Amino acid sequence: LRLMYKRKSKRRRGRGDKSNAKGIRWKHVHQQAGRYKGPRSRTFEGGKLPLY
RNA sequence: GAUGAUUGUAUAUUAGCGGCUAAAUGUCAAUCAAACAUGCGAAUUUUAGGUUUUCCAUGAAAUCUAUUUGGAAGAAGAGGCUUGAAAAAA
């Protein structure tokens, strides 16, 4: 039994430099280390009042 | 120092939001401006460490407004990418 079409494979982060995984460096260096990546809100705009 | 706020001893009291203190932040189980043990009360970090196999295609920025604007690019928006082409004899 076959699908007759190629199936997407898995891509685990932090598995070799040569891998086709997503970025690893940006996530660590140039990013907020707060476990939220920002204020724990839904309407945040950077100080200024929200749109609403 | 040694006739005196002398020394020494069995068993006892004061418990951390505290007690002791002839008053030093000195001491309470040999780094106490607030002791030690346990915790399904399962700890937070704009700083900072680490992040594991190959090959190929494509391919950045250090610019702007705002944040009483910062500095070792924090967050949000905008800007920046695959559009084209480039094959010829009276």
Side-chain angles (χ1 to χ4, degrees):
Chain A
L1 303 171
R2 220 167 292 91
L3 282 157
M4 300 293 179
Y5 82 91
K6 194 165 182 66
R7 187 178 151 203
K8 291 196 174 186
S9 56
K10 295 182 182 169
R11 308 185 186 162
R12 305 134 67 208
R13 302 197 194 196
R15 299 292 183 290
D17 307 324
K18 312 296 189 173
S19 71
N20 63 344
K22 296 200 169 205
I24 211 79
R25 289 117 202 155
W26 204 91
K27 180 159 186 170
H28 175 85
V29 182
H30 312 300
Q31 188 148 80
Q32 167 166 0
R35 107 192 269 279
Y36 290 109
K37 289 88 82 181
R40 195 217 180 194
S41 305
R42 294 165 290 163
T43 80
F44 195 72
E45 299 196 31
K48 60 181 175 168
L49 275 54
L51 187 58
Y52 84 98

